[PDB]
């Protein structure tokens, strides 16, 4: 059972997938390969809830039917500068324009 | 192996190289370091293109039931222009 | 006419199974290769139907004639019923290109008289008014 | 030269439906004895081959989306070996049971289509044989001894 995720921090979004049996620390490990930051410098989030490095992704909520390839679940990432952990900050995507007239019902 | 696709508004999307090569345009944009800038595709469009890359690689040649790829009406036209440019 | 049914007269019990979110239009090609519409299938419904061996079927979105797949391919041909088992015709969505899926959505939101009022390149006007049609798709498969 | 095959179809179908209580609505000169001869010749066919008449009235399975194929399938097989007068009588009699069974299954709009297909097949696939064999006038006198 595979979940599909967007790991997001500031203006960065990682499109990756993992298993439900996979754990949050294992997800911090694949972040390390991509962003070159060890897991001890990583805080992961689902909405505003820090994820334990031992909880499986299914326990946090990431299931097959809430993390699909066409609608992937969002995981917040926060890095540690030196001693202090940075607060989670995610810049939103741009907004679409107003719906043109010939497309309005 | 991943690739960084950068939208017009500066958003950086880190997708697998295999997924991004769904687009023949992105294929040539990388074959001429592992980055490419889309000066014309905003982040709300480019994020949806990357979801299609995941969706396409997941369900192509898959015997299981295939879900619809959803497209909200407010992004449909912009996404079409992007799909036409990227050829995917 | 290489894409036609064969008048075998040998019955073939088939189960049309709609594993797609679309309302499916079963299309039978008669012995001259002309497509004939059959009753539609709501999403997620199945029908045990009476067909014949060597016949040709294809499956479409009943509203927009978008092409669909049947057992992961273009056309379905009923075969011999072994052990009293019916033949399954699992009808599913294909993986449309992003462009085609976008063309589907824009078509569903814009009247064809207003395609050319959209602020897009002139090539996309042609693509929008190039609606999917069984006839032209039948002739493509013929040259294969 | 020739007769209007459309009127021959309309007059015959209107007669075949009246034999079961149905009145038919929506819809070069042909003599009167041509129509009345096809009536008796058709009713004679059906009594002589009531086995084939019965199995045909049963195994029609008419729906609006199969009626066209059913007609062409039976008519192609009927004249597969060739055309003669008895098979032309069976042709009208087959078109009769399709109109009857159409109204039985509450599919009366199909009667108009069946009449159109019968007229098409006559003007297109039987007219050469009919006129090369004395026309309908030759047919009335082949059945003459039976009236």
Numbering used by the authors:
A (entry chain B): 1 to 105
B (entry chain C): 17 to 48, 57 to 112
C (entry chain A): 61 to 204
D (entry chain D): 7 to 33, 87 to 206
Give verbatim excerpts from the published study on this entry:
Overexpression of BCL-xL and BCL-2 play key roles in tumorigenesis and cancer drug resistance. PROTACs are heterobifunctional molecules comprising two different ligands connected via an intervening linker. The ligands are specific for an E3 ligase and the target POI, and formation of an E3/PROTAC/POI ternary complex leads to K48-polyUb formation and proteasomal degradation of the POI which otherwise would not be targeted for ubiquitination by the E3 ligase. 753b is a VHL-based PROTAC and we were interested in elucidating the molecular basis by which 753b induces targeted degradation of BCL-xL/BCL-2 through formation of VHL/753b/BCL-xL and VHL/753b/BCL-2 ternary complexes, respectively. For our structural studies, a complex of VHL, Elongin C, and Elongin B (hereafter referred to as VCB) was used as the E3 substrate receptor subcomplex, as VHL is unstable when expressed alone.
Advances in PROTAC technology facilitated recent development of the first BCL-xL/BCL-2 dual degrader, 753b, a VHL-based degrader with improved potency and reduced toxicity compared to previous small molecule inhibitors. Notably, the alkyl chain linker of 753b collapses to bring the VHL ligand very close to α4 helix of BCL-2, in proximity of the BH1 domain. The ternary complex interface shared between 753b, BCL-2 and VHL can be divided into three sets of interacting residues. Interestingly, all the BCL-2 contributing residues reside on the α4 helix. The first set of interactions is mediated by residues that form a hydrophobic patch and constitutes F124, T125 of BCL-2 and Y98, P99 of VHL. This hydrophobic patch is supported by the thiazol-benzyl moiety of 753b. The second set of interactions is shared between G128, T132 of BCL-2, F91 of VHL and the alkyl chain of the linker. H115 of VHL participates in hydrogen bonds with the oxygen of amide moiety of linker (closer to VHL ligand) and with the PROTAC. Also, the most prominent de novo PPI observed is the salt bridge formed between R69 of VHL and E136 of BCL-2. Consistent with the structure, E136A/G128R and E136A/G128R/F124L mutations in BCL-2 that are predicted to disrupt the ternary complex exhibited a complete lack of polyubiquitin chain formation (Lane 9 and 10).
